[PDB]
Amino acid sequence: ELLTFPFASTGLEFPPVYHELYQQRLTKVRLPYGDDAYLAIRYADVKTVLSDSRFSIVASLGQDQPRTRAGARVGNGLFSLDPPQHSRLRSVLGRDFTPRRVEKLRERVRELTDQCLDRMEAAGSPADLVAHLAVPMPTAVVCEMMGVPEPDHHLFWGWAETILSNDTTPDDLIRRYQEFTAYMGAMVEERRARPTDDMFGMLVRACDEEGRITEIEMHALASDLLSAGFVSTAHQIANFTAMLLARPERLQPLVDKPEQIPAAVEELMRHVPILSGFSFPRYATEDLEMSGVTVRRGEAVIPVIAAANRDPDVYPDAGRLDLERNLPHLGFGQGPHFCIGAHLARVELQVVLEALTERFPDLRFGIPENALKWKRGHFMNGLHELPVAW
Numbered sequence: 001e002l003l004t005f006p007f008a009s010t011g012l013e014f015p016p017v018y019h020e021l022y023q024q025r026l027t028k029v030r031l032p033y034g035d036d037a038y039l040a041i042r043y044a045d046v047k048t049v050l051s052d053s054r055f056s057i058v059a060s061l062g063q064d065q066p067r068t069r070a071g072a073r074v075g076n077g078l079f080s081l082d083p084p085q086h087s088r089l090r091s092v093l094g095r096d097f098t099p100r101r102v103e104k105l106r107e108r109v110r111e112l113t114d115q116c117l118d119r120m121e122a123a124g125s126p127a128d129l130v131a132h133l134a135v136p137m138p139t140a141v142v143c144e145m146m147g148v149p150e151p152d153h154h155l156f157w158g159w160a161e162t163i164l165s166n167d168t169t170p171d172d173l174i175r176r177y178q179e180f181t182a183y184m185g186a187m188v189e190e191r192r193a194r195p196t197d198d199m200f201g202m203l204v205r206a207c208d209e210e211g212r213i214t215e216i217e218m219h220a221l222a223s224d225l226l227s228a229g230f231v232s233t234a235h236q237i238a239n240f241t242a243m244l245l246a247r248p249e250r251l252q253p254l255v256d257k258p259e260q261i262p263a264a265v266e267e268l269m270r271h272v273p274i275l276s277g278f279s280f281p282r283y284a285t286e287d288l289e290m291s292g293v294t295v296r297r298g299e300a301v302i303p304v305i306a307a308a309n310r311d312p313d314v315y316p317d318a319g320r321l322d323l324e325r326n327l328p329h330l331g332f333g334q335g336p337h338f339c340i341g342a343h344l345a346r347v348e349l350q351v352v353l354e355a356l357t358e359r360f361p362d363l364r365f366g367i368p369e370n371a372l373k374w375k376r377g378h379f380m381n382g383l384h385e386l387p388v389a390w
């Protein structure tokens, strides 16, 4: 009988069972759904799973995907493909997410952040940082990039939640798909009649004018970006703020030394266990060795990125949040599926800390920290609410 995964923990806890496993051979676990899998936890092994071509993201051998969600994760977008099919589809978005394009969005990201903090301050201390900033700012940023109007934001929140809830069924997923495809269908029509200079329009051109992708792939790319592109940073904005506010000096190191904000963001990315479960398993495509075990063809290995980011040999005193630490974390993944949004996410999180430190240097929890309400059945770790006071 096998060890169950994911492991017990609450909030942003990193549980001690990892300290035991780092010292042992690769371990097989049973998951909430699908087949058993091995647990890659060493930094080098997680990197291997995510970037070696002997690890496929596609269950091409009849596997039942190891997962935390009742309905298997399947579709026609970026997580459904290996190179080189993956690489050809991504390259349609590629140019829109390089550092040279994303650095152009700093001003806008700050403008929205400032508008969020204006409404939060207007509401009065103590106020929920989740509802006033973590949710609205990242939603606006990607919805404006794509071309979705503010009145429609709530629809994408709903669709993204269904993907990210562990009690979602195949039927729940069929409903999301029908709702979403209808909505994108309207957007595709609108832009065929009236083209626009946004990301929907870019995909509509790539489908219709240059024949680079098909309609199903244009829909899939849109779906991936609007599913991944804002619930992510939302959770992280509140997780990062909560980590800072739980330390005795709170925001003061970054008030005093604003230039260290990019480094803090990186350390927080390394430290925060953002996933409550785990991402896509990969499947070995030939027999290979990993941490003393022969992984046979077809068997699954889960890349545990939170465990990689606390590898005891890569990161001395890995549990310590040291905003000045300086090896590259796996918090945006690695290899082919490394986060297309990574630079946008860095920009959003940097800007948020700039805004928070410049405007509320004495930010503090607005409730006792033991009263913090951490989410329970979500794909990600985070707060239902984050009351802050100034």
Ligand code: HEM
Pocket (backbone or CB within 6 Å): 050, 078, 079, 090, 142, 224, 225, 228, 229, 230, 232, 233, 236, 274, 279, 280, 305, 330, 331, 332, 333, 334, 336, 337, 338, 339, 340, 341, 342, 344, 345
């Ligand atoms: C703090 C915020 C974020 C974190 C921690 C994060 C983390 C990750 C990680 C670890 C993966 C790889 C998962 C795997 O290989 O199994 C990934 C993939 C992806 N992320 Fe991000 N991400 C964030 C924000 C964003 C944003 C802002 C976008 C906006 C477009 C985005 C879009 C995507 C997409 C489309 C993929 C799939 C890439 C591919 O398969 O080619 N993410 N993210």
Ligand SMILES: CC[C@@H]1C[C@@H]2C[C@@H]3[C@H]4C/C=C\C(=O)NCCC[C@@H]5NC(=O)/C(=C(O)/C=C/[C@@H]4C[C@H](O)[C@H]3[C@@H]2[C@H]1C)C5=O
Pocket (backbone or CB within 6 Å): 072, 073, 074, 075, 076, 077, 079, 080, 163, 173, 223, 224, 225, 227, 228, 232, 233, 274, 275, 278, 279, 280, 380
């Ligand atoms: C902040 C953490 C980041 C946020 C990112 C959002 C990512 C999740 C969402 C990413 C894409 C998406 O939802 N695209 C549309 C559906 C297509 C297809 N069908 C599914 O049922 C499915 C998933 O169900 C994916 C779950 C991802 C799993 C992945 O692990 C998450 C990333 C996660 C590691 C599919 O991909």
Ligand code: NA
Pocket (backbone or CB within 6 Å): 259, 260, 261, 262, 263, 264
């Ligand atoms: Na820095």
